[PDB]
Amino acid sequence: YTPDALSASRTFHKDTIFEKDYQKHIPELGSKPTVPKDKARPYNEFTKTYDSTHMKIP
Amino acid sequence: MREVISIHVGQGGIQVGNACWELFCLEHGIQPDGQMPSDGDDAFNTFFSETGAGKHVPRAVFLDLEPTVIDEVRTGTYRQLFHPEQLISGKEDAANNFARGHYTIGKEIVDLCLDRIRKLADNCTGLQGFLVFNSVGGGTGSGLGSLLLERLSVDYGKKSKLGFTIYPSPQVSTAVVEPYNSILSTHSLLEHTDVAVMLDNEAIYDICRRNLDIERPTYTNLNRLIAQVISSLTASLRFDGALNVDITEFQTNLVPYPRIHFMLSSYAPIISAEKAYHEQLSVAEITNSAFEPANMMAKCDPRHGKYMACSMMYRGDVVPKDVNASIATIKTKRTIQFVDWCPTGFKVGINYQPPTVVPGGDLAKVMRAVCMISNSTAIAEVFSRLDHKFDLMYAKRAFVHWYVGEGMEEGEFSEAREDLAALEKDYEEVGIET
Amino acid sequence: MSLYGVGLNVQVDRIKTEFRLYVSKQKGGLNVRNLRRIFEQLDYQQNGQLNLDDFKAGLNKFGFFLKNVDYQCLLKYFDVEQNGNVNYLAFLSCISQTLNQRRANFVLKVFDSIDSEQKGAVHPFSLAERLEVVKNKDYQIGSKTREQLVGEYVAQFHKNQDGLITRDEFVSYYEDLGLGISSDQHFIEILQTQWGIKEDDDLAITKEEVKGIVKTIRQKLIQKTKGANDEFLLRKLFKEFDISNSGFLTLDEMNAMLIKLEIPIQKRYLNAVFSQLDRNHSGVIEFEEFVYYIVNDPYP
Amino acid sequence: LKRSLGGVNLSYANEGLVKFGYTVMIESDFMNAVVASNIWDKITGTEEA
Amino acid sequence: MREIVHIQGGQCGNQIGAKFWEVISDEHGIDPTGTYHGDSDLQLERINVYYNEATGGRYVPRAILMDLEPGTMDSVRAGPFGQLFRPDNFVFGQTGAGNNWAKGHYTEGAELIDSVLDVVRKEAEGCDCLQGFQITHSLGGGTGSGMGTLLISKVREEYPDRIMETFSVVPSPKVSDTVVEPYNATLSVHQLVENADECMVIDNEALYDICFRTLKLTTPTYGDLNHLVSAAMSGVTCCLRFPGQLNSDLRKLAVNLIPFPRLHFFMIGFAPLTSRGSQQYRALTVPELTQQMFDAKNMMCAADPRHGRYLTASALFRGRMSTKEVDEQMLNVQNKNSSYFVEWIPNNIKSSICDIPPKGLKMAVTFVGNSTAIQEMFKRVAEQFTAMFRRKAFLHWYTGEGMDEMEFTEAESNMNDLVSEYQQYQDATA
Amino acid sequence: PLYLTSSHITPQKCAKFSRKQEVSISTNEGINSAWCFEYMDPKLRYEMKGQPVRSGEPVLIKHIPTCQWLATDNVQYNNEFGQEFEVFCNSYQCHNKTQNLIAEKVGRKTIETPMRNQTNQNTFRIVTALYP
Ligand SMILES: Nc1nc2c(ncn2[C@@H]2O[C@H](COP(=O)(O)OP(=O)(O)OP(=O)(O)O)[C@@H](O)[C@H]2O)c(=O)[nH]1
């Protein structure tokens, strides 16, 4: 009994582009970096410290 | 409202700075040219300053007496990012000699460095502190680190200073004359550094071989790991979380006495892309891995000694109840025991921002990460080994002329040795029960 | 000065550069094409020759003032037939740029957008509609005598015997205008705001980025297995999928190999590296040549 | 053998002046002999020569 | 920019330098006419180290050819790459040395050395920031061993702080071509020990052995030995001229190599070396390179290091490669060969990495070692010296120029003291 | 395309028989392909520069990166196509030395002009077609 075809014999990789699920969420190199969404520590009322009138008080 | 000034001196300092700044740029979405593509408000002021037209100048300075690496920085992919006049380059290398970089050649470059530091700091009026990077076992790096620490300690005074210093490995090393300038630099930095962090290379080699399954890692991977560590430490200053901690709350929960300011750092998880999917990555198990001694980035075995302070920072989607459960398990296990006069020494921080994976890197995408900084009495073993090396070297006065001939007197070795012996005494003395 | 030999050349080149710099600094109404139209009034008989006094008067009328030494040097260089008269045509043939490729692409696409019929020519009246609608939102479609009224936006060009505006003179006039405007960015800004068209290539792949990518892929193969190996490891994928056994790689095949070996490059960067690797331009890479480049190359 | 010994035409020279693009013979006078190349034999080198 | 200047003298010095310049010109892609024809920009960024700029974009080497007889320079000017050296860098006399140290160091050298001193001073003040000097010469010849070392003394007096290396091809007694060899050898080594920052010992028998038994080449010439010497000489300064993971200049190598001022006599080696017929059958890897590194069969000196203990050693790697395997290989070879390493200097190996390999190879290794086994040639030379000197054979030629037996006496004293301290610093223990 | 090139002499890579500089047909397109003609006689080599090269004349072939002349000998070699000799690069100049440096100092001769004769070995002939 012939072992079906030689192509039926197992190969380490196959013509499936995404051969293993391992590499489908990996970061693709030349992609532009993505700006983070609305996630950083609240800082809005402290601007009246870089307001230049803060110093020279008298 | 917060800015931190990063200093990179020595070839190791510059190589680490390149990697960490690349990670920072990727984190904040800047292109290599330093331009923002047209895409909730930034808060990248910590690392970059906006010129007014789109360009973002990093808040860093590079110092070296050997112009090769700085020339490569000015030639590589980041030419348009760095400000050209904040990359200071010398003429001749110190050639692994501490006295050359501390007494003869660095004098004509420290003035320019101070001028540029002042010019960078005048912009920062909510400045948090200074971070410094240097290889201890390198001549110019060590000498300029000592000189800059001495000058800044009197120029600014109370500003917090953290030094992520690269000590030579105990059993392996590159040079042969590293003990001399190693102890010289340690003596210099003892009273000039608020926080010191160990960065030996063989332990991170071990981490890479065991976890990342890389048989021949190079310095690039090491720098990437260090960059991930520093990003995890700093993310609290630029990303909201349940518990926020600043660099000001480090000398209060990590420095019981001013003499003891050397802390060792861990990181977790260290998982490759091929490894991430078959792991659930529980917070409890990553914490268990972090406290495992072989997961240390320093060849210091904490189960040799006591624990004084323990500060851990989480980033991702962790939950405080699981945090407390993991801490309870850590306290329950008997292989880890703290010092008698510290009932509670745990300082926990939480941040919402998950770590970002770098293209061309090797770490995988994860949803939870922990960075670790601890005080252990077992750290004295590396100092004892350096003492043994220095005794073996100084017994027959080898290499001594190479330090005598350029202006530093012979008596520095004796005082440095006495100081390090005093540190060894302090480390044991802080380890006896009342 | 001391124009003995190529002193002539170095002394006329500076005059070229200062003329260019003066026009660029003016940056406004003054256009180089105005010189061509202003010389014919002094030409009288269109012989192509003008004396030194008339040349000086014409230059002073434009507003480009020069020293007496300069005038003698220009006379010496551009008096080709040595009759003592400078050839203004020969002068204007110089000091004219051939134009940047980016500006050429922009002007060609601008012309093609109008010339939908692709006949290569354009009716002068057609340009007027765009030139006016870009400037006003309430101009409304039909004017009473719109042809003559809005022909003032046009006729800075010239028309052939048929009367259609030719692509060559279109690009020539914009080239002549782009002499005071020596900015790629600001020139593109003017053109795009004037024509109401916003398109351009984002960027071209740069050599240092190419070097970074090749260094990354060059280092990645080292990490696997042992030092002597990675050659057999690279050969083994080629054996796995090279069915015809011819020995030729392709773009998609190289993309697959990179995807197998944990390297997801952009399509554009992959095309850039492919083009850099191949000089035959056949879109095929010899496997042994690729191996030799990636593995055995002293230069980065 | 058949691929080695194929036919070929040498380009003619006008006024005996060599110009780029012609196909010419190179001959060592001291051997009184013409140079040829053996592609099938491979030199000992990583690059193919 | 931290450039170095080259001075060579004598027949052997000229022969070594001629091929060193051809090799460096080939690596930098400079044609014999002096016009750059490289491929990448890395070849031009640091070209100022060895070459000075001229009109037309051409470059000239900063080398000085110094001698008493114009025969050797006369022959070398007519060969390939003879047009690079500018004609003002040739200096020579009209008499010749006669293989006499006395005539080459007291009579003709003294009167001739003014011009060569003037030209070297001119070039040294010309260079931006001088880094150091390299010399290549022979200890068995007259003109070299005398006038070159007198130049060494004068330039050391003039520039005390600069680094100075010498490549001395000290001849062997197995097959020597000169009978007055030990005399001028001892005089040269005595004069050189107090002035040379580094010493680079070269032996002809070692080169013959390597080229015959490793290259398997049946009929080599002096050209081949010159090429090995040139490759070794270029290897030390590779990371100085080109980028790398670990930069290590000449001063760094010195400070990491010499523990004591008077122990600055080193032996070197190059790797890998293979026959053409075995290239396909050898896999070039770090273990193979480090195994070929420390083989006493590979050294360029007649001294066997297995008879002594390595005081210090250094490693110059060329070619892209990670540092892990280098680190554990160094540690492994130190652990399994602890008996051959002197104990009180643990981890006495320096390592440096440069990412630009030699053209035609992917990886390369330059080894320089300071070991106590080097004293064997000192004792053998001293024994030959005393064996002739007891009879005062050939001393009339030396005494004909005012020299007396005293200088011989303290030269023997200096050699005895050196061979004496090389024993104390091989027997000293913690 | 395949180009005729040479690379500097190395003990690692020396000729199988001649042991001298190699000549090789390779895929390299670098500077090694740079080949230049030279007119035969010693007296007029310099002044013949810039003059048209005419076929059928005795010429010299020299490499640019090495300034070495290509030549052949009665050196035996075996391949498929019968028994054949060797082609390589080498300077077959006459052995006697001449005082070029001292002539330089006096000012009688300048470097670009040659002074050493080369033997008949180095000659090469370009052959065109007989009929159009
Ligand atoms: N972790 C790490 N260490 C480095 C790196 N680069 C150099 N080192 C360390 O630095 C030591 C040698 O000093 P270098 O950094 O090469 O040079 P330097 O510190 O500027 O001092 P000089 O040698 O005098 O120029 C080595 O033993 C390394 O351990 C690096 O990129 N990462």
Ligand SMILES: Nc1nc2c(ncn2[C@@H]2O[C@H](COP(=O)(O)OP(=O)(O)O)[C@@H](O)[C@H]2O)c(=O)[nH]1
């Ligand atoms: N390796 C090598 N050694 C050489 C060469 N030429 C001469 N020598 C050595 O130089 C020694 C003779 O030195 P000598 O010519 O008298 O030195 P000089 O008097 O300074 O010119 C011999 O023992 C040779 O071994 C050469 O081309 N290669």
Ligand SMILES: [Mg+2]
């Ligand atoms: Mg350094």
